[PDB]
Design a protein that fits this description.
This is part of a larger assembly, with one copy of chain A, one copy of chain B, three copies of chain C and two copies of chain D.
Chain A (H helix, E strand, L loop, with lengths): L1 E6 L25 H15 L5 H4 L10 E8 L5 E5 L38 E3 L3 H5 L8 E2 L5 E11 L5 E14 L3 E7 L11 E2 L6 E7 L3 H20 L1 E6 L16 H5 L3 E10 L4 E3 L2 E2 L4 E2 L3 E3 L5 E8 L7 E3 L10 E6 L1
Chain C lengths: L2 E11 L23 E2 L1 H17 L12 H9 L3 H9 L6 H6 L14 E3 L2 E3 L2 E3 L7 E4 L1 H17 L3 H7 L10 E4 L19 E2 L4 H14 L8 H5 L2 E4 L1 H10 L2 E8 L6 E11 L5 E9 L13 H11 L3 E4 L10 E5 L1
Parallel strand pairs in C: 6-9, 7-8
Antiparallel strand pairs in C: 1-12, 1-14, 2-4, 3-12, 4-12, 5-6, 7-9, 10-11, 13-14
Helix pairs in contact in C: 2-3, 5-6
Chain D lengths: L1 H19 L5 H33 L20 H19 L16 H6 L3 H25 L2
Helix pairs in contact in D: 1-5, 2-3, 2-5
Classes of the chains: A alpha+beta, B alpha+beta, C alpha+beta, D mainly alpha.
Chain A binds a DNA/RNA duplex through α1, β6, β7 and β14.
DNA sequence: CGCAAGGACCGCATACTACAA
RNA sequence: AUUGAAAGUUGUAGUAUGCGGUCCUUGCG
């Protein structure tokens, strides 16, 4: 099931910069999964009181009910779902694959049209996700970032008693102005009890939305149906591609980008020949624990859209077109589709 | 950085850095027109510091060494008149937290004493420029995508005294790079970065932060920035400065004009963004940008030569040979300006709003050149147009056959007016 | 805590408003579209100040009673009542009911949270000079669609079955040279309207106008801010999206101002600038989300969402407010109807 | 601003067309430039109908009936007559049809003769026609002064 | 506001007068200034100010203006007031760039120095 | 706040030109209007500026009758500010700050704009009566139902300040609506023929509901003294016309005075380069009102003489009553002189 | 639905002037004399008075000045070109001052269906002055159109 | 015994945001 | 149980200063 969350106005998922008296500026980033997870958990917990403390996982860092991930969406004539653009797509909408030249002992990941390329910023339609997993990126399956939302800026000032500007009472913030008929959508595991309609306050500065529960669309069911074909193709080729739809915390004790083969062994892969990780800058993030009313430990996460190219010996045994990764999985982290490269 | 802002040359030539230096007791002052004012400011500073020293040492909160060194460690912000509105404001500007009727009288005496000084040399400037310059993708030249044919690297005419086939081959194939050539290029870069940049900056009375290879970062007074940014662009393009080699390549610049109040982190981020935008728009350009304390951010990306056209127009305006009212009418008419009308409209406006003579014609020609030299940022195939804009005369021909061919002009004029407005400020 | 109910506010301007933003001093605008907007922060500040002044003056109709804030202070604060009363008088704190409704003061803000969240006010009608009949109230289908969806939030919470039927009928498509308007703005003879300098033609589909009027009738009452509803109904025009966008971009007033030095008697150096003003008679609305009072041991008669909603509706019905700066020169007066 | 662009394009077009006829003859170019400059002053003092009547009167011909069409400016004998016929033709064309059916401004007169339109209409039509004529004349003044000799 | 004294000026025509008001297309080709609503004839204050300033400047240039029973010489009096800059003012006045000292003081500055005071 | 309200009425002795912004379009310098409707208006900023200047100039002469005591700037400042007062006195000498009374009432000066707001608010002046040439009779005052509507709105706003229920009822007693061309005309303007009142270039038809007009006159007698700014009110009662909205708007656009001005060369005897231009003037005898509001004085340590809204209102009423004001540009050419009735 | 008298003045002036061209196209002398008379009448009106000019028109038409009926003066009766032109001009002026553009039109004359000469004979000065103003305006417009077209 | 304004000049120059927050 | 709860782009400030609808011309053969 999904939760269509049309925002009333701009929202602010603040960056971890402190809001000091002198440091009175703020900037918004793309919404992290943990914020939406916390919002949904609070919405369920408050309505049903303390009797659902175990389900909400009160105090604990993880709940019991499952949240898969969050995609963006819009209503361009139809309810369209969009995900982050993978880092392996060039501006010319051309895929990028490794071309390891064993003669020189290198593993260059150069594209098919040169050894230099820059990732295509934007979003990939969920309808085209199957084609991308099959390495057949179309031309009308992607849209840029500015067509969905544009960042806006605001100022604020706290007045003194009568009419003058109070000392140390000036601030400036920056928020996300979603375009018309373009909001967020949280993907929740089926079976979790939730109210149908209402409102929910997400993010800082006390901003709300108009959340509405909806069943899964046709795109996800189509992907699930074709997953078996994708899986047998991957088994035949021996070259499996992993694409990340949400940030992941794949690091072991001490966060790191080294994809440990132990997680890969659980999917049926026996021997991992090689791993080629292409990503971007790490994401540093820490939340605000309500129970202790204190900031959470900082965590570094692989940015969304990173691609892992793996050549393997064995068979993939998953019956689902996606696989969870890392820790804090229930919050919606580490959602990764698998395709053929 | 307020020191850099005050480093700008005043009308008399005695920049406020020297004036503050005497107050700090570090350097002498050559001029003696307001020597009594200097003594009044020094006495006011010493009395205020001593009075503050008595109170601060009374609780012994701040270390005594800081109080002792406060004679020469007084912040240059005290030289700003607005900072001396009240005793609390002066205490905060000095740095020590406020959390004194006699000091109130002292502030009044200091304010009156500083009034005479500010009446002659003017208020201490509170604006400065941040400049970051980067090399124009040296990886392309190192790979050999920018080198010329091998004929440009023979001795004089050896191609004549060789076989026809070898001559033909050397006529077409672009020369690659050998380790000796790479070492030569690296030494040339060192010569530019070490032996030329610090001297050029010291000529411009600026401050150099980090000059590593082809990366330059400087904080400059507003009075001499656009000159220095031009001069460096020439030094990076010279091939033989006498017997000393130079890189002889192109570079991309980013310049920001800001008041001394904005946070350093935001200023650095904005300047980096401006440099990146200049690089993206086609390189070989500078993204000038002015951000006032109010919030207005006027930005424009131009070639380095167009700074000369802007300088010519600004000199025309400051000399009052042409009234500074044509700018606003032209800005209003820009959104309804096309190629077919612009020249006639500009000529008519220059005739109407000047003192006639050849000044109107000269202004019109300089405006035409400046509007020609502007990098437009459209949507779609901006790479082709921007490359032609940085190319030269091909911009006029390509734009003639261009599809849009209107929006490019609409944005070119608006950009050229924007930095003209910036330069006319100083 | 969570948010349960959603009230609707209606701001009608009678003097130009200058809710300043970050032309040298423009008015706040949206980024995606460009319509004039008033940020929720300004409304929250204005409402908080008005509520604080009213409660300190003891004129609050809390369930039709005289709210003695000092008397009720000891009921909840008990021992700490004297300190809170002193701090409130020292401006370091706020009156108890205001703290409960809007939130704790900026000093002790980490203890509890407010129970109201004000949204950005969005425009609904824009006055534009017309050839026949003055200042036609113009609007666009995009604004209609946003209103229809937005109201669906509050009405559904209110279980307003009758209103929801009318909402679904708000469907219209307009070309750039087409408009639907009442008979007052229509020129006699030729079926055209001359809004500003454009010669838009009439589409002759007035069914939409009445439904729009009925929504206003139910939301704000038949007494339309001291005006007969018929006069406003007869002079409403709806045009395409782009025409309305251009109107919101340009029709706002621009005023140039100066400062004259006493010596000599002419403009001093650095003494000229420009300002932008929203026109008067500009219909506008805003939604406020109200939740359960997060305060602990709150005084009785204010304990549920319905109680707070009724208190707000009573206090802020048919009132007068000043929004934004330039109050000293008679800018910002607005009539508020819930 | 689309109407502004339409007005600017129309003014440039008519001034260029005046440039084409008697390009070397500075007599026609000079007379027309002064005629466009002095025209808006009349409109303020006496209104649109009076100015149109004056334009019709200054033409030296029987001028049977009233037609914004016909009356070829080249057919006029004196240079002043040609310039005045040109001015009348341009103004009447703009008020009748603007630039065309597909243009942003289709003309307030719905293709009708401006003088007949004024004669048989209401007051508000006269008001808007007056304001539009004033605006186009304001643009035409600058564009004819700039380039015409 | 800043006024303290006033004088009532009376005008008696001895020859027919004609204060121009442009040209119309009516029966009278060169009509006269009238207030719009009343329709009575009138002479605006601008024409009077111009005529008075012109006469004052003409009389001062010929040094025939007698203030306190003494001629107010344009060059001599302005020499004391403007002090060092008097040479620049005298040359500018001779070039018909600015009005003489007394006219500038009384009827306000000239066109070139309109922003002075 | 704004616990007290005073209504200001202005009568234009001479033509008034309140300069607009940029000098665009055919007319060079037009009067200030509002794009929203098109009627003439005077923004509150200029009114506040001129009122502040007049008040400060009067205070510097010690001619302000503060409770019939002739408050002294220096003496009151010394009494109030005590020790620091002398320093402020120096700032008064340098024409930097302003005397105590004007600083308290109108707010501080530019350099001290961080202590308290202005204890007053000046609204935009809106037209209420417009002179218009007439065939029979001469110089008929004209107005329209929309003006009366706005007046009723202003009265209601005042009632939210002083609870003037009687004023609200009196305003509500008037409700007229002329449809297309018919007018409510006084006895004088009516042509000797059957009805047919001719205003400017329009021929109308009289409407026999003149009682409303009488009521309007009563409202004037209620608002602006007894004599209509120095004339018999009943005398003006014979020359008031009420017309439809569109006709009134047409009058407010094509009946302001238009003037051409030139500059004559020093010796050429003719105009010079950049000499000819145009100006638009609001006609004389135009009646325009406003709405002054006063709230709580926010100044710190206010004097005992003026320490309440009633005191400030009384001071404003006595200082400005049948006085004279200079408004807008073109001062030296006898433009902008007005009579103020509170 | 409101037309100023300016619209009706131009409409009326166009009606009569065009009514002369089609009627007397070949009689160029008649057209010239009518144009000259329309040019010369306003100065007579301004110098002597509306009644004086009307009586003068009657005198040139060899008719008694005491009893008139503009509705009973067929312009075609006069034989001389000057006489016919004078008859046409007098008829146009009197018809405008009696009925204006028309009863249906916004303006319907001033005398309310009375002979203007008698109206000047038996009315106060103010009515005469207003009628003189109206006659001046219509004469200006008729002169404009006659010069333009005739 | 009729003749019936016509061109010059068509806003110039200056001011062109300040200080707090 | 969400880097969260809290904060009115607000105070002051006159589109103002300078400027002659002027010059040329027989109401006449």
């Amino acid at each position: 099931m999904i939760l269509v969350m049309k925002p009333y106005d701009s929202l602010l998922f603040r960056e971890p910069r402190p809001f000091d008296v002198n440091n009175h500026v703020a900037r918004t980033i793309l919404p992290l999964p943990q914020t939406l997870a916390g919002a949904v958990r609070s919405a369920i917990y408050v309505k049903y009181g303390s009797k659902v403390k175990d389900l909400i996982g009160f105090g604990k860092e993880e709940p019991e009910f499952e949240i898969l991930g969050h995609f963006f969406y819009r209503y361009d004539g139809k309810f369209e779902l969009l995900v982050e653009s993978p880092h392996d797509v060039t501006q010319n909408l051309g895929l990028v694959k490794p071309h390891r030249i064993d003669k020189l002992g290198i593993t260059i990941l150069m594209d098919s049209e040169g050894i230099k390329f820059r990732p295509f910023n934007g979003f990939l339609k969920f309808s085209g996700l199957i084609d991308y997993l099959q390495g057949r990126i179309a031309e009308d399956s992607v849209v840029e970032r500015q067509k969905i939302f544009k960042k806006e800026r605001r100022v604020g000032i706290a007045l003194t008693k009568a009419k003058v500007t109070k000392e140390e009472h000036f601030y400036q913030v920056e928020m996300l102005r979603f375009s018309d008929d373009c909001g967020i959508a949280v993907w929740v595991e089926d079976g979790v009890d939730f109210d149908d309609e209402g409102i929910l306050g997400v993010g800082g500065e006390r901003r709300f939305v108009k959340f509405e529960k909806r069943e899964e669309p046709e795109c996800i069911t189509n992907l699930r149906s074709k997953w078996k074909k994708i899986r047998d193709k991957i088994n035949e080729t021996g070259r499996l591609k992993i694409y990340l739809a949400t940030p992941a915390i794949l690091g072991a004790k001490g966060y790191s980008s080294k994809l440990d083969y132990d997680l890969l062994g659980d999917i049926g892969i026996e021997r991992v020949r090689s791993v080629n990780f292409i990503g971007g800058k790490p994401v540093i993030f820490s939340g605000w624990d309500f129970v202790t009313r204190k900031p959470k430990p900082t965590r570094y996460a692989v940015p969304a859209g990173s691609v892992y190219f793996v050549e393997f010996e064995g068979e993939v045994k998953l019956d689902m077109p996606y696989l969870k990764l890392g820790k804090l999985t229930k919050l919606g982290y580490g959602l990764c589709f698998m395709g053929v490269w | 950085v307020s020191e850099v802002a005050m480093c700008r040359r005043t009308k008399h030539g005695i920049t406020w850095k020297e004036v503050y230096d005497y107050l700090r007791g570090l350097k002498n002052v050559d001029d003696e027109k307001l020597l009594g004012k200097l003594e009044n400011l020094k006495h006011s500073v010493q009395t205020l510091i001593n009075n503050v020293k008595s109170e601060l040492k009374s609780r012994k909160v701040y270390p005594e060494e800081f109080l002792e060194g406060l004679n020469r460690n007084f912040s240059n912000e005290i030289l700003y008149s607005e900072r001396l509105r009240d005793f609390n404001t002066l205490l905060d500007t000095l740095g020590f937290d406020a959390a004194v009727k006699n000091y109130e009288t002292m502030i009044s005496e200091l304010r009156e004493r500083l009034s005479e000084v500010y009446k002659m040399l003017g208020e201490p400037p509170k604006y400065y420029a941040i400049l970051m310059m980067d090399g124009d993708e040296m990886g392309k030249l190192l790979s050999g995508e920018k080198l010329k044919t091998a004929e440009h690297y023979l001795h004089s005419a050896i191609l004549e005294r060789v076989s026809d086939a070898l001559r033909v081959k050397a006529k077409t194939v672009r020369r690659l790079i050998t380790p000796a050539a790479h070492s030569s290029i690296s030494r040339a870069l060192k010569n530019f970065s070490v032996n030329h940049v610090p001297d050029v900056v010291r000529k411009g009375n600026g401050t150099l932060i980090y000059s590593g290879g082809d990366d330059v970062l400087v904080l400059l007074p507003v009075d001499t920035a656009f000159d220095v940014a031009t001069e460096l662009a020439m030094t990076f393009s010279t091939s033989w400065n006498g017997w000393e080699m130079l890189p002889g390549n192109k570079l991309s610049a980013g310049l920001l004009i800001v008041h001394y109040k904005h946070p350093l982190y935001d200023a650095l981020e904005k300047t980096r963004e401006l440099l990146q935008k200049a690089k993206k728009l086609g390189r070989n350009a500078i993204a000038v940008g002015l951000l006032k304390r109010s919030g207005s951010y006027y930005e424009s990306v131009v070639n380095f030569e167009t700074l000369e056209d802007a300088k010519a127009v600004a000199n025309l305006l400051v000399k009052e040979q042409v009234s500074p009212r044509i700018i606003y009418e032209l800005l209003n008419f820009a959104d309804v300006i096309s190629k077919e009308f612009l020249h006639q409209l500009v000529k008519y406006e220059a005739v109407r709003h000047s003192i006639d003579k050849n000044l109107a014609e000269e202004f019109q020609s300089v405006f035409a050149r400046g509007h020609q030299g502007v990098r437009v940022e459209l949507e779609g195939n901006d790479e082709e147009i921007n490359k032609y804009i940085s190319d030269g005369a091909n911009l006029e021909t390509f734009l003639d056959k261009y599809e849009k061919a209107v929006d490019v002009i609409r944005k070119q004029v608006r950009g050229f007016l924007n930095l003209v407005k910036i330069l006319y400020e100083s | 805590d969570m948010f349960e109910k959603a009230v609707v506010f209606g701001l009608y301007s009678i003097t130009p408003v200058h809710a300043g933003s970050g032309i040298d001093l423009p008015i706040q605008r949206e980024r995606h579209t460009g319509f004039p907007v008033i940020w929720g922060q300004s409304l929250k500040g204005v409402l908080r100040s008005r509520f604080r002044q009213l409660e300190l003056d003891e004129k609050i109709e809390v369930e039709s009673q005289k709210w003695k804030w000092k008397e009720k202070t000891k009921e909840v604060l008990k021992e700490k009542a004297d300190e809170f009363i002193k701090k409130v008088e020292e401006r370091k704190r706020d009156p108890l009911l205001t703290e409960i409704v809007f939130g704790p003061a900026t000093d002790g803000a980490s203890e509890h949270a407010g129970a109201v969240s004000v949204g950005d006010a969005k425009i609904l009608l824009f006055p534009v000079r017309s050839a026949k009949g003055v200042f036609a109230f113009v609007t666009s289908p995009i604004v209609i669609q946003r209103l229809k969806e937005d109201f669906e939030l509050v009405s559904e919470i209110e279980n307003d079955i009758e209103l929801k039927q009318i909402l679904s009928r708000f469907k219209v498509e307009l070309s750039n040279n087409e408009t639907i308007a009442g008979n007052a703005l229509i020129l006699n003879g030729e079926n055209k309207v001359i809004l500003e300098d454009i010669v838009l033609k009439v589409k002759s589909d007035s069914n939409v106008i009445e439904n729009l009027v009925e929504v206003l009738k139910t939301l704000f009452g038949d007494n339309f801010f001291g005006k007969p509803i018929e006069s406003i109904k007869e002079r409403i025009a709806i045009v395409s999206d782009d025409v309305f966008k251009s109107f919101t971009r340009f029709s706002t007033e621009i005023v140039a101002r100066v400062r004259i030095d006493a010596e000599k008697g002419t403009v001093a150096r650095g003494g000229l600038w420009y300002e932008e003003f929203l026109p008067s008679d500009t219909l506008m609305y805003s939604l406020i989300a109200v939740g359960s009072p997060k305060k602990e041991n709150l005084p009785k008669e204010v304990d549920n969402t319905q109680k707070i909603v009724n208190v707000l509706k009573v206090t802020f019905n048919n009132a007068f407010l000043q929004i934004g700066g330039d109050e000293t020169v008679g800018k910002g007066f607005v009539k508020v109807r819930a | 601003r689309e109407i502004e662009q339409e007005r600017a394009s129309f003014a440039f077009k008519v001034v260029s067309d005046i440039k084409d006829k008697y390009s070397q003859n500075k007599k026609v170019q000079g007379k027309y430039s002064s005629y466009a400059e002095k025209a808006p002053t009349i409109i303020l003092n006496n209104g649109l109908g009076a100015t149109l009547a004056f334009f019709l009167s200054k033409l030296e011909k029987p001028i049977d009936d009233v037609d914004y069409k016909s009356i070829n400016p080249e057919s006029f004998g004196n240079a002043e007559n040609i310039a005045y016929a040109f001015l009348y033709k341009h103004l009447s064309t703009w008020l009748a049809e603007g630039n065309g059916k597909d243009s942003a401004f289709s003309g307030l007169t719905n293709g009708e003769d401006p003088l007949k339109y004024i004669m048989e209409k209401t007051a508000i039509d006269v008001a808007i026609s007056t304001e539009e004529a004033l605006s186009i004349l304001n643009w035409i003044k600058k564009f004819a002064k700039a380039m015409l000799e | 506001d800043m006024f303290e004294k006033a004088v009532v000026f009376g005008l008696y025509s001895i020859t027919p007068v004609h204060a121009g008001s442009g040209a119309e297309l009516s029966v009278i080709d060169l009509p006269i200034q009238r207030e719009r609503h009343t329709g009575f004839p009138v002479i605006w204050g601008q024409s009077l100010k111009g005529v008075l300033r012109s006469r004052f400047r003409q009389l001062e240039l010929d040094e025939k203006i007698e203030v306190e029973s003494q001629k107010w010489k344009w060059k001599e009096k302005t020499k004391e007031v403007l002090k060092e800059k008097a040479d620049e003012f005298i040359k500018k006045v001779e070039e018909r760039k600015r009005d003489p000292l007394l006219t500038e003081i009384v009827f306000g500055p000239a066109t070139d120095g309109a922003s002075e005071h």
